[PDB]
Structure formats: C-alpha cells, structure tokens
Amino acid sequence: MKHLGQTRSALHGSHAVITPETFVRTALAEWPGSAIVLHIAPVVGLGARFVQFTAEMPAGAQATESVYQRFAFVLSGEVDVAVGGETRTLREYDYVYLPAGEKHMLTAKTDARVSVFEKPYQTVEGVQAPGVYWGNERENPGYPFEGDDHLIARKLLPDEPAFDFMVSTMSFAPGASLPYAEVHYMEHGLLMLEGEGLYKLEENYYPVTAGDIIWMGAHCPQWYGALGRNWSKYLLYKDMNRHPL
Amino acid sequence: MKHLGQTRSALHGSHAVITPETFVRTALAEWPGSAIVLHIAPVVGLGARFVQFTAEMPAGAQATESVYQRFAFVLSGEVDVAVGGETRTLREYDYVYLPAGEKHMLTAKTDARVSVFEKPYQTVEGVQAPGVYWGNERENPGYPFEGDDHLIARKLLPDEPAFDFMVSTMSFAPGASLPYAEVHYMEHGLLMLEGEGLYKLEENYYPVTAGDIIWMGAHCPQWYGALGRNWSKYLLYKDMNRHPL
C-alpha cells in the first residue's frame, strides 16, 4: 500500500526510522556516476552533526575524497580503495577509515553498495589525528556486551581519544535484547544489516529489518529486541571522546 | 517503585494488561477459606461474557460447584477433584472441565494456585452438553501453528460444536511471534504461564512476563513476540461454536 502513503518510516524531534521504499536517490560531487541515498543529514529533527548515506556504485565508477573524515563499510560487491601508494580490494563487511582530507579513490570492481559515515574532525590541541585504518567486521571477535554472550559487540575502530567517533556492530541472537533502555548524550546513526525485531525509541516501538536506517538524537531512550530465526546485526555510529562544550 | 504509582498495567476500552502487583484478593461463596483474584469480569471496559480469576487455595481448603461451567487449571501445588464417583489429584498443568452444575469438590493437598474460567452454557437444540473432561497441558503434543515449529498450539478442550468455548496454550521459542496480527469477534482471556516478551494490543506494545493477565476485547488487533532465553507460553480462553446473534 506504499502508493497510498503507508510506510514504517517516521520522523520525530529526537529520532527517525528510515525505510527503503521511502529512499530518494540524489548525487554527490565526489561520487561521480554513483547514486546516493542520503539517509541522515545535519538537518534531521533537532539536529545531527554528521551524515550517513549509502552509495550504490555501478561497476567502474570512481569516488574520490571529500573534505571530511570518511568511514566506508562495504555491504555488497567489491570496492578497491586506493590511498597513498597502497590500494586494497574490499569485499562484504570490509571497511576503511580515512582521515579528513586524505587523498584517495574508491573504484567499484563490480556493482556495489557502500555504507558511508562522513564527519568533520574535532582536533585536540596535543593529539595527532589517527591515520588510515582498515578492518573486517567478521574477523573481529567481539565481546559479550555487558556479560551477555547473546549480544556480541564489535568495535570497528580503535577505542582511543585521538578518534572523533566510533563505529561498531551489535549482534543479537533471536530473543536477545539490550539489557536496558539507553539514554546518553551521544547521538546514533544506524543501519540494520541482518535480521529483524522491534526497536524502541522514546515512547514508541518500531518493527525494523535489515535495510532500515535509524537516527537517534542525543539522550533518546533507545532499546532493541531481536525476533525471527536469524541473528540480528546492525552497524552503529556514535560521536566520541570530545567535551560536549 | 510501585508505591508512587508505577506499573506495567493499563486499562482500555477494548484491552487490558493486568500485572501481579495490582492484584486485589476477594472471596467467593463456593471457595471458602480461599482467596480469589477476579482478573476479568463482564464489567471490564466494554464488556466480557465470562469470568477469569485465580484461586489461591491453602492446603486443606475446599471449594464446591457454582451454577456455571468451570475450567480449572493448576498453576502450582496439588488439588484433589472429586467428581462422579472418582477423585483425582491434579498438579502443575493438570486441568478439568466441569459441566455447569456438576457436583464436585476441589481439595488442596498443598498450598495451591488455580487458574479458573467460569461461564454459563449456551445450549443448541440437538446438541447434548459435553461431560467432564480431563487433561494435562504437557501430554498434548500440539501442532506447529501456521506450519511453524517454533509456534506450538495445544487445544486443551475437544474442538467439537457441543462445547461453549475453548481453552488452549500458545508456546513460542525465544525469537518466535504470531505470523500476523489477529482480529476476531471472540474475546480473549489470557494468562502468561512461561517466558516473556512484547504484546501488541491495538496500537501499543506491552512488555509482559509469566504471571501477567491480559484481556482482549472483541476485534482487538493482537500480536505477540517472544523474548529472552526461555520459551513463552500462555493459557488462552475464547468462546466458540455459537452464533453471535
């Protein structure tokens, strides 16, 4: 019933549930030839300080650096990431963190989809910005969230003060759920990678599946429960290590 | 925190979630020495056509027949049922269907808790009222609901046109859920026996656990999703086999 206005999407002051049928393809100067679905922009509800979008890259397309930090996570296909002198071919669940300004190129070796977080860097007087960082979600042997072995967390980026943010994945066995509703000053940006369940944000519960994007404003009560026969997995962004003032 | 008005209970025109901390003990003529918690009565919101309550029987307590049909289901303890010329001890998950008027006595061998469904009997012309019937929830190896082996339904009373109603159990594996939201004329008397999860009634989602009672009004959209590590299981009541007019 999409053509009569029905959707699972919703927009609120401090959160938004963005589902695939509502997607709108636009474009970005640094991503010539690719289709861009910009899910979270600084202009959502009460405010956001980053952007999350997925780049649908046709085989052969090239994308170069922007003025911001760039975290690219390959959802499908194969993407060659060429930095200085060295270049690697990324496949499903491989990712790269590129410092703001780092000259580089992304080439789609085959039709691909890449999840991207872009954020400006908040320097710290005596700290040097982190260099390029590569990684694979699956090689990472996460930790039981808060002792729970049915909720595996995997920090994809070094948990160090030099970093501006963090990107991690949360995997829930069927029936598993966050220990409690979280309420913290860090805002979230998420993409449902695998599975389905009910996500609680403020007073409402939302049915969500792989493919959905969620914006969680600062201090937004948030909880999740995984349903179905498969494990749920979602990619998560959250600003970190900087004084809120 | 209940002393400042906090509870997971909620009352509505077509549905209600009733939690253990809100229970009020009362008494019934046929249940001398026992405490009765009348959960659902014909006066709930828009109306009910039966009564659901639990009896907390102290060892030694004896209860006799009422003028209505009585379906007793043992939650804990042991209860002797003396009907016809025989007597049987009932323990956890043992139940008995007693025709309206049938003389009988329920004696508690030990402190017991009994879930009871009572209601008048609607006679059809060429249909003789059914006789006493015994069973045990676990004996009954149910059937996969919609062909889903993680959703086992167990009919506790024979599914014949002679019966005025039906009692059954719905069991869910940690990640299971009803395949679709249900909407039907027949009302519901629900008692959570095992597990926990989220019950959607109309437009809201309610977190519930073993112990919780739920009243679903006619045509009340309903759905359930099981969470946690254990299976969920709930006792269900619903009138059947009679023309609504």
Side-chain angles (χ1 to χ4, degrees):
Chain A
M1 208 77 102
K2 299 69 203 309
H3 55 293
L4 294 186
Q6 170 183 57
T7 46
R8 305 198 319 286
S9 294
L11 182 276
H12 282 86
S14 303
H15 75 85
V17 181
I18 309 152
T19 55
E21 17 70 66
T22 76
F23 287 1
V24 177
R25 275 74 180 173
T26 51
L28 287 177
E30 45 271 332
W31 299 74
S34 292
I36 296 305
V37 180
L38 226 148
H39 314 108
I40 299 167
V43 287
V44 256
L46 279 164
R49 294 79 66 190
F50 65 104
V51 306
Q52 172 186 164
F53 59 82
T54 60
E56 313 180 323
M57 307 180 81
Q62 307 182 309
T64 52
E65 355 88 39
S66 76
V67 167
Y68 324 101
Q69 288 180 292
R70 175 178 295 176
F71 179 92
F73 190 94
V74 180
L75 311 171
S76 63
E78 281 183 50
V79 184
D80 280 334
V81 177
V83 298
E86 160 189 52
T87 114
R88 306 190 195 178
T89 168
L90 309 190
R91 280 166 277 262
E92 190 186 69
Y93 287 13
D94 282 324
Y95 56 93
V96 182
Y97 159 85
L98 301 149
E102 259 293 86
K103 215 168 298 296
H104 71 90
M105 181 183 278
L106 304 173
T107 297
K109 295 191 61 176
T110 176
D111 292 354
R113 291 175 56 253
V114 192
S115 187
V116 179
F117 292 118
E118 283 204 306
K119 175 191 191 310
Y121 182 72
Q122 302 179 57
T123 60
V124 175
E125 228 318 77
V127 176
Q128 186 171 66
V132 174
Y133 185 92
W134 313 78
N136 177 85
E137 198 271 350
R138 303 207 180 81
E139 304 181 322
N140 193 311
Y143 57 100
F145 189 50
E146 286 212 0
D148 192 345
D149 53 307
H150 278 8
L151 208 186
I152 306 304
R154 295 183 169 85
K155 293 178 182 162
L156 308 186
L157 294 172
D159 194 357
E160 309 175 336
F163 274 81
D164 215 37
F165 57 111
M166 172 61 81
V167 185
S168 66
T169 58
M170 293 289 271
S171 299
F172 309 70
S177 68
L178 287 180
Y180 52 72
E182 301 194 320
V183 171
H184 49 258
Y185 84 90
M186 303 132 262
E187 77 189 319
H188 280 17
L190 93 54
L191 170 61
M192 287 289 300
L193 292 178
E194 301 163 34
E196 60 189 358
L198 297 173
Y199 216 105
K200 192 185 181 200
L201 300 156
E202 285 177 57
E203 246 65 1
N204 305 310
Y205 285 87
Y206 296 88
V208 298
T209 22
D212 297 349
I213 279 85
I214 298 181
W215 171 57
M216 294 171 253
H219 301 96
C220 181
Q222 48 186 272
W223 175 87
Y224 181 68
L227 298 183
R229 286 163 174 286
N230 307 305
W231 272 59
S232 287
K233 182 190 292 293
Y234 65 62
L235 212 225
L236 186 68
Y237 155 103
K238 71 177 66 183
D239 48 309
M240 294 284 278
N241 321 311
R242 300 287 123 95
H243 196 102
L245 297 172
Chain B
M1 186 51 134
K2 295 69 187 297
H3 62 292
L4 294 184
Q6 173 191 58
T7 56
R8 310 190 320 270
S9 296
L11 171 285
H12 280 70
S14 293
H15 78 83
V17 180
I18 309 178
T19 52
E21 31 107 345
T22 69
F23 292 166
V24 176
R25 275 70 189 184
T26 45
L28 285 178
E30 35 277 354
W31 300 74
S34 291
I36 301 305
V37 186
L38 280 146
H39 301 137
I40 299 166
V43 294
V44 205
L46 285 172
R49 300 87 69 167
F50 61 112
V51 280
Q52 175 185 165
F53 65 79
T54 59
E56 317 183 316
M57 305 177 79
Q62 300 173 305
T64 57
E65 358 74 67
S66 63
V67 185
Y68 326 94
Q69 289 180 295
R70 174 179 300 176
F71 176 88
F73 185 97
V74 181
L75 295 175
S76 51
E78 289 156 59
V79 184
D80 285 318
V81 187
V83 199
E86 57 189 63
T87 70
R88 311 192 183 193
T89 61
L90 294 191
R91 57 201 90 245
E92 175 170 287
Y93 289 18
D94 278 335
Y95 59 87
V96 186
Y97 162 91
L98 298 151
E102 268 293 276
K103 283 200 171 191
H104 70 80
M105 182 180 265
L106 309 183
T107 301
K109 276 220 165 188
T110 62
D111 295 344
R113 289 179 50 237
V114 190
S115 175
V116 184
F117 296 105
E118 272 185 335
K119 70 159 297 180
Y121 180 70
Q122 302 174 62
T123 310
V124 186
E125 214 57 78
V127 182
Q128 181 172 49
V132 176
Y133 182 88
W134 316 78
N136 170 86
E137 200 274 352
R138 302 201 172 83
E139 291 198 314
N140 193 326
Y143 56 103
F145 193 60
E146 225 60 302
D148 180 355
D149 62 293
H150 279 355
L151 217 210
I152 291 70
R154 291 178 175 76
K155 294 171 186 172
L156 306 182
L157 292 180
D159 200 354
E160 323 175 309
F163 284 76
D164 208 321
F165 66 98
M166 169 65 72
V167 181
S168 57
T169 65
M170 286 294 253
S171 300
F172 304 67
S177 67
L178 289 176
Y180 56 73
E182 278 166 42
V183 170
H184 39 201
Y185 80 107
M186 35 205 237
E187 284 191 356
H188 281 49
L190 191 311
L191 167 58
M192 288 285 125
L193 290 174
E194 293 167 42
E196 56 181 8
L198 295 174
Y199 219 110
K200 190 187 178 187
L201 290 164
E202 286 176 47
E203 228 73 294
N204 308 297
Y205 286 86
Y206 296 75
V208 307
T209 20
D212 295 358
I213 273 73
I214 292 175
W215 172 65
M216 300 176 253
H219 301 75
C220 175
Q222 47 188 274
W223 172 88
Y224 182 72
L227 290 185
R229 307 213 166 192
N230 311 301
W231 276 55
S232 294
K233 185 199 290 300
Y234 56 65
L235 227 211
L236 191 65
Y237 164 105
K238 57 176 63 175
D239 15 48
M240 291 280 278
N241 316 306
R242 301 304 124 139
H243 189 96
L245 294 162

